[PDB]
Design a protein around this ligand. Structure first.
Ligand code: ANP
Ligand code: SU5
Ligand code: MG
Length: 302
């Protein structure tokens, strides 16, 4: 393999892991519905269902997300085409992608299986996720959001605990980002949308910062921090002060970090550059946290 990795400043462990995923990916060609065998259901959301599958020609275990869309063939083919950009989205903070295709009213998004599942699944087991672990989560989310914005000019548009994937090797990765404009166009009791997004305001990385901040407070406290009825919830986000991390249990740097993510005004709200040099991030990056060890003990893995 003739790797074109230099654009990413990677540690040797990150370089080895990314190279091992890309090498495994070389076993995979054209994806067909007939070449998959359903192992189990990993989970489901509003738009689709994701299954742990076996890709029979390669032997690879994958996570197959199926999104039901029986629409005009010309527009589903535009979607499938827009999804091919995912082949170029190589980052330690972005879930690996094997391929995307359409079959029998379903668009399939085949990706790297993350054996730790999502952070909302681990939150159920953990109760509360430790501040120090959330420091590593914060770094991975900022770096992933930065990679997407800087390298592919894409915004996530759907940052939430269920869209942050973890594994037994201690990797933290984003998934379900807005790579396809046509998929967004063609496509509850909890909302992670920024107050300005809920009012109609054009999307921005600032909205992703809000979603990240809210997700952090939820994971830190063990529950959705607003609270409930639909309008009641959205009226609270738009017209009431943002939620705050409780005092006496969390560091001042972590409280200040989430406060800067949750500023109602998107202009005063912190950007990715400012968040990357925030005391919380600087502290968290210097800490030796055995995230892989903590994850394997709280959810019972390797
Ligand atoms: N690559 C993956 N590896 C392992 N588990 C995964 C993977 N992708 C998704 N999952 C799991 O599948 C569950 C359901 O996924 P999904 O249908 O995207 O629901 P959602 O994240 O709650 N909604 P949304 O992203 O807004 O469409 C997630 O909560 C994850 O736990
Ligand atoms: O559902 C989408 C999606 C949403 C809006 C626009 N384009 C795509 C998606 C799934 C997915 C899995 C991995 C990486 C990126 C991903 N994006
Ligand atoms: Mg998701």
């Amino acid at each position: 393999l003739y790797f074109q990795l230099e654009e990413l400043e990677l540690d040797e462990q990150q370089r080895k892991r990314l190279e091992a995923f890309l090498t495994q990916k070389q076993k995979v060609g054209e994806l067909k519905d007939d070449d998959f065998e359903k192992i189990s259901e990993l989970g489901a959301g509003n738009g689709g269902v994701v299954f742990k599958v076996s890709h029979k020609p390669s032997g690879l275990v994958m996570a197959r997300k199926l999104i039901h869309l029986e629409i005009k063939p010309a527009i589903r083919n535009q979607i499938i085409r827009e999804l091919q950009v995912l082949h170029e989205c190589n980052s330690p903070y972005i879930v690996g992608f094997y391929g995307a295709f359409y079959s029998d009213g379903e668009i399939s998004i085949c990706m790297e299986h993350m054996d730790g599942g999502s952070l909302d699944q681990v939150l159920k087991k953990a109760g509360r996720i430790p501040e120090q672990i959330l420091g590593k989560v914060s770094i991975a989310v900022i770096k992933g959001l930065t990679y997407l914005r800087e390298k592919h000019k894409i915004m996530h548009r759907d940052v939430k605990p269920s869209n942050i994937l973890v594994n037994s090797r201690g990797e933290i990765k984003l998934c379900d980002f807005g790579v396809s404009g046509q998929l967004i166009d063609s496509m509850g009791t909890r909302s992670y949308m920024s107050p300005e997004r809920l009012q109609g305001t054009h999307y921005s990385v600032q909205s992703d910062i809000w979603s990240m901040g809210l997700s952090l407070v939820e994971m830190a406290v063990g529950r959705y921090p607003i609270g409930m009825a639909i309008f009641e919830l959205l009226d609270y986000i738009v017209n009431e002060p943002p939620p705050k991390l409780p005092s006496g249990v969390f560091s001042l740097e972590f409280q200040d970090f989430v406060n800067k993510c949750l500023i109602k005004n998107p202009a005063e709200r912190a950007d990715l550059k400012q968040l990357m040099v925030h005391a919380f991030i600087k502290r968290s990056d210097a800490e030796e946290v055995d995230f892989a060890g903590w994850l394997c003990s709280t959810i019972g893995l390797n």
